[PDB]
Amino acid sequence: GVTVFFHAIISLHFPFNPDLHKVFIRGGEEFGESKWDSNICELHYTRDLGHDRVLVEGIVCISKKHLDKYIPYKYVIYNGESFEYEFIYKHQYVNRCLFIKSSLLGSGDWHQYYDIVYMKPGPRKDLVKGKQIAAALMLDSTFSILQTWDTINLNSFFTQFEQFCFVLQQPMIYEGQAQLWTDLQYREKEVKRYLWQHLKKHVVPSKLKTGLIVLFVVEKIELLLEGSLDWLCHLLTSDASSPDEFHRDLSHILGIPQSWRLYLVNLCQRCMDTRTYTWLGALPVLHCCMELAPRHKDAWRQPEDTWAALEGLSFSPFREQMLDTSSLLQFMREKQHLLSIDEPLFRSWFSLLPLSHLVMYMENFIEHLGRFPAHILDCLSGIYYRLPGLEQVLNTQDVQDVQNVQNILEMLLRLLDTYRDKIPEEALSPSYLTVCLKLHEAICSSTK
């Protein structure tokens, strides 16, 4: 049939002892047709958790018919001289319902995480502490798999994590029929804070793989890294020297079907909406997910998000409202190596900067342009997208902003003259002449 692993937390309601007390599960005719007629399974005690609590674990074999449906199960404890039934502080026989979805069964092993056992001698508070302890124990158990890395261990980790999330998000109880947890209706903020600190503590000592696992966990349990995303942005910040090594690390984990793009877009969009800049380091990974487009000859027709490799992000508000540019360019400079391992990143950074500082960007990153000459043309493209702003600038006959525009055009001429010999014919295309025409038109129009 199928093998099921059970895990149960016992608490001060019972001062457990490995000799005094024994633990068993009792069930209906489902696991086996001895409906409440025997100790359906015996559980082995492998942990002590303090707080007078303890973790017990068990294994059972179940025929397959029960997939896609509900088995009923209940916990029973042997107190040394008698057998008692567990208690669940629900306001209303009442038991638990175990459900085994074939969707999550990849290898055929079902792990029934997240089981709390209270004996009949607050109850909400007890179950809150319990929910926290259980989610921590599940994170630890799942992370234990990564001890050796490959596609197999990753798939096992994802399977167990998805089973955990399926039972926690659908914590069903049985009363004739299966129903959603009401005595608690598992609560988030109190638990999610503690689990967030636990994840931070355990993860803080390959970095990218850790960061991607953290991102998957955060998005799946619907967590937010409160006001401190920089640490996760750092974990996903590559220290690579070449593109091959970056792709080598990312290949296995990203090769696993998940919504990596959506998770990374959410992360970057939050790091922008909270006005921080460390997210700039994670952009390469999103580009690896983006499946970027060729340099279509009529590139100028492309919208900016597609040209900047930022499909899914609202860069303009961050670009304008964010003020601290000196720190932004110093960061871009410290992480200049990233520009070598990701072609589009130069365009993306270019788009996120305001007009005033664009020149220092092309100045701070002119060696890169000598090493990647074709990026020079992307500067023209960026200015094309800036074209509205330059008009609004030129219509106001301000000496400072006109000087900025003059400096931008002088920088472009300096680059096109200096690297006239390096610009490859592949990056070149007639369409760029159109871009310069549009630029010229705007200036002729605005300059009064």
Find out whether 351 and 304 touch, Cβ atoms under 8 Å: yes
Q: What whole-number distance in Å separates Cα of residue 80 and Cα of residue 44?
A: 16
Q: What is the DSSP letter of 29?
A: T
Method: cryo-EM
CA dihedral 58, 60, 66, 68 (to 10 degrees): 40
Crossing angle of the two packed helices 260-273 and 207-220, in degrees rounded to 10: 90
Residues in the chain: 448
User: What number of other Cβ atoms are within 10 A of residue 239's Cβ?
Assistant: 12
User: d(Cα 8, Cα 23) in Å, to the nearest integer?
Assistant: 9
Amino acid at 410: E
Residue found under tokens 């877009």: 265
Alpha carbon distance 409, 81 (integer Å):
91
Compute the distance between CA of residue 215 and CA of residue 209 in angstroms, rounded to an integer.
10
Separation of alpha carbons 155 and 110, rounded Å: 14
User: After which residues does the chain show a gap where C to N exceeds 2.5 Å?
Assistant: 92, 121, 205
Non-local CB neighbours of 401 within 8 Å, separated by 6+ positions: 393, 394
| 167: phi then psi, degrees, rounded to nearest 5 | -80, -35
Question: What is the distance between the alpha carbons of residues 426 and 368, in angstroms, rounded to a whole number?
Answer: 18
- Show Cβ contacts of residue 342 under 8 Å, excluding neighbours closer than 6 positions: 243, 246, 283, 284, 287
The DSSP H or E segment spanning 85 is: strand 83-87
Cβ atoms of 389 and 438 closer than 8 Å: no
Q: What does the block give as tokens for 26?
A: 């009792």
- Is 101 in contact with 67 (CB distance < 8 Å)? yes
Would you state the torsion angle of the CA atoms of residues 7, 8, 9, 15, taken in this order, to the nearest 10 degrees? -130
Which residue's structure tokens are 């503590």? 201
Of the candidates 373, 352, 363, the one whose C-alpha atom is nearest the C-alpha of residue 419 is 373
Element (H, E) at 117: strand 109-119
Cα dihedral value 190, 279, 337, 407, nearest 10:
-160
With beta carbons less than 8 A apart as the criterion, state whether 280 and 329 touch. Answer: no
Q: Given CA atoms 136, 139, 145, 146 in this order, what sign does their dihedral have?
A: negative
Resolution, rounded to a tenth of an Å?
A: 3.4
What's the angle, vertex CA 147, arms to CA 141 and CA 151, rounded to 5?
A: 100
Let me know: does 183 contact 91? Beta carbons within 8 Å. Answer: yes
Selection from 412, 323, 329 nearest residue 375 by Cα: 412
Residues 6+ apart with CB under 8 A from 129: 51
> From residue 350, how far is each of 261, 363, 427 by CA, in Å?
21, 12, 18
Q: Which residue has the tokens 């633990």?
A: 23
Question: Residues 12, 118: contact at Cβ < 8 Å?
Answer: no
Within 10 angstroms of residue 243's Cβ, the number of other Cβ atoms is: 15
Buried b (16+ CB within 10 A) or exposed e, 29-61: ebbbeeeeeebbbebebeeeeeeebbbbebebe
Nearest partner of 26 among 84, 102, 101, judged by Cα: 84
Q: Which DSSP string do the residues of 132-165 spell out, in sequence order?
A: HHHHHHHHHHHHHGGGS-SHHHHHHHHHHHHHHH
Supply the DSSP string of 325-344, one letter for each residue: HHHHHHHHHHTTTHHHH-ST
The residue assigned the tokens 């090493």 is 371
| Cα–Cα nearest to 115, from 93, 92, 94, 138 | 138
DSSP lists the bridge partners of residue 96 as 73, 173
Closest by Cα among 135, 141, 143, 252 to 195: 135
